[PDB]
Amino acid sequence: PPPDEEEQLLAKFVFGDTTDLQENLAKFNADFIF
Amino acid sequence: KQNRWLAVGSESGFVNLYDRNNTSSTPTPVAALDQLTTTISNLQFSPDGQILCMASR
Amino acid sequence: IARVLAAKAAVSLRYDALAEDRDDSGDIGLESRAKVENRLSQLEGRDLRTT
Amino acid sequence: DESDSGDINALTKILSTTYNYKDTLSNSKLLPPKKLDIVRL
Amino acid sequence: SSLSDQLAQVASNNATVALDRKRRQKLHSASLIYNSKTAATQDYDFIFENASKALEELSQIEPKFAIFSRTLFSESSISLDRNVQTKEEIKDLDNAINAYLLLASSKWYLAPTLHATEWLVRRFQIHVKNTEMLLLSTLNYYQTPVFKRILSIIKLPPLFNCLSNFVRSEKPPTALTMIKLFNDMDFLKLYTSYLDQCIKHNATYTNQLLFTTCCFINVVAFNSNNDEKLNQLVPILLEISAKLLASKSKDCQIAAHTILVVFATALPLKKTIILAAMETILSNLDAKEAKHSALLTICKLFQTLKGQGNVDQLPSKIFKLFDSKFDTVSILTFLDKEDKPVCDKFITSYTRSIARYDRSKLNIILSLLKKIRLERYEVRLIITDLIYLSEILEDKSQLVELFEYFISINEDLVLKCLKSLG
Amino acid sequence: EDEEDIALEFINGEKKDKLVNMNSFTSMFDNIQNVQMDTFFDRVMKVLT
């Protein structure tokens, strides 16, 4: 069965994943911040 | 036609320019040219009144 | 600046001492203060080093 | 993404069409202030 | 090219790799809060801890900063390195950095911003990679101590070498040199692009507009003697004026009012450019304070016109637009104030436009002429048009009164126009 | 009356203006701190007038 959300958080911390961050950078649209 | 400019020379090189169109015992000159440093021996306007040629011999 | 401030110091002073109906306002000095402040700005604004 | 197919963008348009931004001095009947167009004979 | 020259280009590309310990010391030593010796001793975790708190304070001042908490100031950002990423990823990082430098542009006076930017300087080496955006955002603080620190830790781009002297120098850069940096055209295109980004994001603030205005005005003055350069300046700076006028923010428009006026006096322009300028000015004129500044700008522009038709009537579209943003009562109030600027040519044009287009305002012509003394040539043009009006338009009490006014003052000129016309 | 008199009547009509020189807006930098844009707008006119 697929991982629970709270697992994905620990998995993010333990393995030090940065795919979540790189996604936000890609989604970063300047007009949205302004 | 009536003249609208008046220029008065001077040995020191100053040339005081007076606007005839605008009377008093003491009139204030519009400008006080001093580029020359010697006696003004010629003062002459262009026929239409847009250039003043000041010279020192 | 010492030369500029002293020269304007004399002018402001000679008005204080020798004025008959001087007002207690200091108007002449304030105008003198502006001229020194302007003279300081352009004097300091210059740079000796080539840019 | 782009195709052409009082408006605010009037000024930017008139800049595009014109190359010479200084009015011709031949038409005017006052001479320019600081520059003299003088030729020797 | 010599071997040394090519290797230099390799070094410049490879500036932030941190290949060996000595390189790691120079890179890690650069700082905006701390001296060199302490800087070498610190770790990324300690630096990030301060920034996380500092960003929180900025968030309270302005909610927009909270977004970067998810991207640049996240706990994952500690492990993030730029040298290891791909070309596509670094562009997104550069875009995120550039957006942040815009928000922090106005809050440099506050203490927390200087902490928050430390995280980017240490982690993302913006002082080496995003050098241009950092200097441009902090250009107006040139006398502030913060700007001095920025110079010391930053390698100047080719365009900013005017500041090369003021790196690690006690005196801050003088006002005069900033004019030199703006004087080069290439910088203006660069600054124009940065300024354009601010308008798109509505990130502008008064201090930036004041400083941006003061430099642009001065650049024209420094180029007053050289006509050919002034010609090259018009495409760039007037284009900025169109963008500033597009902005809703009033202070942006007023800066456009400053910058337009100085060209008009600095360089005579074609009427079409002048007329085009009015429409842009009047399109977005909503703020009262901008409204006052606009009317002075309109009058000042026409005074610079020195060609045939200088006092010709405005085009119909321009006339309707002007009256919408300035009713007849307003301009009479403008004509009232004793300290008015010279506006005779515009009023002559605005006068003739009424006769052509709006008959019922013809009474207002009487009031306008009395308030301001118009030039003789202007009055002659007004008489000539009103003569045609009587032949075409039906005779009116106001119409004859306008003549009757001209009868009272300078009667002889009235005959001359009538003699030439009828 | 003649056409020339109309032309000569323009030249009298035109009025003097203060040209912009290099050392005309230099002082702005000194007092460009904590001033609303509108005040700065007026001063530019003042030197220009």
Side-chain angles (χ1 to χ4, degrees):
Chain A
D4 188 16
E5 192 282 346
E6 190 267 299
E7 180 172 348
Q8 297 157 20
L9 294 174
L10 294 174
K12 208 264 192 163
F13 181 76
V14 167
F15 311 123
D17 282 0
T18 62
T19 62
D20 186 74
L21 162 55
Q22 268 159 41
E23 209 165 308
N24 303 353
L25 274 167
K27 184 162 311 213
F28 187 98
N29 264 324
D31 55 356
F32 277 38
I33 297 89
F34 300 100
Chain B
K1 295 190 274 141
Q2 184 174 359
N3 297 277
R4 69 158 302 189
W5 291 121
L6 187 143
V8 190
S10 55
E11 292 174 354
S12 55
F14 277 79
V15 174
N16 291 19
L17 180 72
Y18 286 109
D19 187 359
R20 294 311 320 310
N21 67 19
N22 187 358
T23 66
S24 61
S25 69
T26 185
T28 62
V30 178
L33 307 197
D34 54 337
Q35 322 315 331
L36 290 180
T37 70
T38 56
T39 178
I40 307 301
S41 63
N42 296 114
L43 271 172
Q44 182 171 357
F45 288 83
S46 59
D48 59 343
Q50 283 181 157
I51 302 175
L52 165 58
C53 177
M54 65 182 180
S56 172
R57 64 181 179 175
Chain C
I1 295 295
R3 205 205 300 98
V4 174
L5 179 140
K8 287 291 184 292
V11 159
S12 55
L13 192 54
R14 279 181 269 228
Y15 177 89
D16 291 331
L18 319 174
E20 188 214 22
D21 58 355
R22 64 183 305 306
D23 63 358
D24 204 33
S25 78
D27 57 341
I28 308 307
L30 288 169
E31 311 176 30
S32 294
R33 179 137 184 138
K35 294 183 183 65
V36 184
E37 181 175 20
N38 286 0
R39 180 56 179 171
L40 174 60
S41 69
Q42 63 182 356
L43 180 58
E44 202 195 350
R46 267 191 51 261
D47 53 353
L48 277 293
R49 266 179 273 87
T50 195
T51 177
Chain D
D1 201 4
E2 301 180 354
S3 289
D4 288 328
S5 81
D7 59 24
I8 307 164
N9 56 358
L11 188 153
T12 183
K13 293 155 101 64
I14 189 69
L15 296 185
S16 66
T17 69
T18 50
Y19 294 140
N20 178 20
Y21 310 100
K22 186 162 99 145
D23 176 27
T24 61
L25 80 170
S26 62
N27 66 58
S28 169
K29 53 163 150 73
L30 305 159
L31 76 168
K34 299 295 294 296
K35 285 332 191 303
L36 185 63
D37 193 351
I38 188 154
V39 297
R40 189 178 176 185
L41 316 174
Chain E
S1 66
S2 83
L3 178 61
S4 44
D5 173 14
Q6 293 144 100
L7 288 171
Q9 184 44 228
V10 166
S12 83
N13 299 133
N14 194 287
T16 49
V17 174
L19 297 150
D20 65 332
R21 275 195 163 270
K22 296 297 294 296
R23 183 67 62 82
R24 174 62 70 182
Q25 182 176 356
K26 293 184 185 84
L27 271 65
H28 204 66
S29 286
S31 73
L32 288 175
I33 308 295
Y34 312 107
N35 60 281
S36 63
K37 195 192 71 142
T38 58
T41 301
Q42 320 193 35
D43 186 74
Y44 279 126
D45 297 328
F46 169 47
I47 298 161
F48 180 79
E49 281 300 81
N50 286 320
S52 302
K53 183 65 69 176
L55 189 76
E56 180 39 33
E57 281 137 13
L58 301 178
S59 178
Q60 301 279 29
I61 302 294
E62 173 175 4
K64 291 178 179 172
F65 285 107
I67 300 299
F68 299 114
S69 72
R70 314 161 61 52
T71 300
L72 291 169
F73 298 85
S74 311
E75 281 85 339
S76 64
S77 76
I78 302 173
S79 303
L80 175 56
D81 171 25
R82 297 181 57 174
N83 308 335
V84 66
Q85 302 269 304
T86 191
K87 180 53 91 162
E88 271 56 60
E89 290 163 355
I90 183 166
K91 321 190 73 53
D92 292 329
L93 188 153
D94 281 336
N95 263 291
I97 294 295
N98 286 349
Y100 171 84
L101 273 299
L102 261 54
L103 292 153
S105 185
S106 45
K107 281 80 171 180
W108 281 111
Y109 283 122
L110 313 180
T113 55
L114 202 71
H115 298 279
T117 182
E118 181 90 341
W119 174 235
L120 274 56
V121 169
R122 294 311 211 71
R123 181 64 271 188
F124 303 114
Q125 303 94 320
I126 65 177
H127 67 296
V128 178
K129 322 301 292 181
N130 289 135
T131 176
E132 280 193 357
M133 181 65 28
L134 200 155
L135 279 169
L136 281 177
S137 61
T138 57
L139 209 55
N140 56 2
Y141 304 109
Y142 73 110
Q143 58 198 347
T144 314
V146 62
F147 189 83
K148 178 173 175 177
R149 192 54 150 290
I150 288 165
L151 291 178
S152 181
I153 61 146
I154 194 176
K155 65 178 72 66
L156 272 163
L159 291 174
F160 294 79
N161 64 9
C162 300
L163 304 172
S164 64
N165 282 341
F166 302 107
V167 67
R168 192 181 59 82
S169 176
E170 301 305 8
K171 313 286 170 263
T174 72
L176 187 151
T177 64
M178 301 295 258
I179 292 157
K180 283 189 173 70
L181 174 53
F182 272 78
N183 201 2
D184 195 327
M185 274 143 287
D186 263 8
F187 182 87
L188 285 169
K189 306 163 197 301
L190 172 58
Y191 196 88
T192 296
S193 173
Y194 161 76
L195 189 61
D196 190 1
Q197 294 293 351
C198 294
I199 311 316
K200 283 264 142 174
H201 297 319
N202 296 115
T204 54
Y205 54 111
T206 60
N207 210 359
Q208 185 202 66
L209 271 297
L210 271 298
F211 175 79
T212 303
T213 307
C214 176
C215 288
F216 287 3
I217 301 299
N218 291 135
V219 165
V220 183
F222 272 60
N223 297 295
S224 65
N225 300 2
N226 214 357
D227 64 316
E228 61 86 19
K229 291 178 71 68
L230 294 174
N231 194 327
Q232 301 175 356
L233 272 297
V234 175
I236 304 174
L237 311 173
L238 282 188
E239 189 209 8
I240 297 169
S241 304
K243 294 183 174 63
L244 269 294
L245 289 173
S247 177
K248 299 294 184 179
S249 291
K250 65 186 181 80
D251 53 338
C252 284
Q253 298 179 8
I254 299 154
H257 297 340
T258 61
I259 195 182
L260 287 160
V261 173
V262 169
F263 293 102
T265 184
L267 185 69
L269 295 173
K270 286 162 150 307
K271 183 184 286 185
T272 61
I273 305 172
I274 302 283
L275 261 182
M278 293 177 71
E279 190 176 358
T280 309
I281 293 162
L282 273 59
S283 283
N284 283 6
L285 200 59
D286 300 349
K288 291 314 278 161
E289 281 276 69
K291 196 162 289 299
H292 160 76
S293 174
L295 180 46
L296 302 168
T297 295
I298 300 292
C299 293
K300 261 308 306 175
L301 294 174
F302 280 96
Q303 289 300 333
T304 62
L305 293 173
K306 293 178 177 68
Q308 65 285 314
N310 43 48
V311 298
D312 182 314
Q313 69 278 23
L314 304 169
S316 63
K317 203 188 81 206
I318 306 298
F319 176 77
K320 293 178 184 177
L321 182 66
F322 182 76
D323 273 298
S324 71
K325 298 302 186 71
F326 300 93
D327 62 355
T328 56
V329 178
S330 178
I331 193 66
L332 273 71
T333 307
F334 179 87
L335 262 63
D336 189 358
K337 74 163 191 93
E338 62 87 18
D339 57 353
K340 61 181 291 157
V342 288
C343 64
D344 57 344
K345 297 188 179 65
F346 175 60
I347 300 302
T348 308
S349 179
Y350 174 105
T351 292
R352 291 151 52 84
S353 299
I354 297 169
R356 205 80 70 180
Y357 305 146
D358 291 28
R359 315 305 173 139
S360 87
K361 314 312 151 163
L362 187 63
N363 72 290
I364 301 299
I365 301 299
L366 190 81
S367 67
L368 293 170
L369 298 166
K370 178 65 76 184
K371 299 284 294 320
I372 192 66
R373 275 285 77 203
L374 295 174
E375 217 60 29
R376 181 104 165 274
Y377 81 93
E378 303 182 359
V379 168
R380 195 212 283 289
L381 272 299
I382 304 307
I383 302 146
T384 284
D385 289 318
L386 277 174
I387 288 164
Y388 285 137
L389 268 295
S390 179
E391 309 306 337
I392 310 307
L393 169 81
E394 190 276 331
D395 302 358
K396 302 177 180 177
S397 58
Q398 52 182 356
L399 178 58
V400 301
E401 183 178 1
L402 293 174
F403 275 137
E404 191 76 281
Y405 184 10
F406 290 166
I407 301 299
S408 66
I409 186 55
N410 201 352
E411 164 57 9
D412 187 45
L413 173 79
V414 188
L415 273 295
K416 289 185 178 70
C417 205
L418 291 171
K419 182 176 171 191
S420 296
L421 282 83
Chain F
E1 196 158 11
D2 291 331
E3 73 89 17
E4 287 82 0
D5 279 8
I6 303 164
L8 271 293
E9 189 276 331
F10 192 50
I11 293 164
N12 296 323
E14 172 273 349
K15 56 204 310 301
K16 68 179 287 187
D17 48 353
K18 186 171 169 204
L19 311 177
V20 298
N21 296 115
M22 290 94 78
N23 304 337
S24 47
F25 299 100
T26 288
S27 67
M28 291 295 78
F29 280 110
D30 294 330
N31 192 227
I32 191 167
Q33 214 267 348
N34 212 27
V35 306
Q36 190 66 346
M37 193 67 226
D38 291 331
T39 301
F40 184 108
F41 182 76
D42 300 344
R43 305 167 45 180
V44 169
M45 220 64 58
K46 198 77 47 170
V47 59
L48 276 179
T49 306

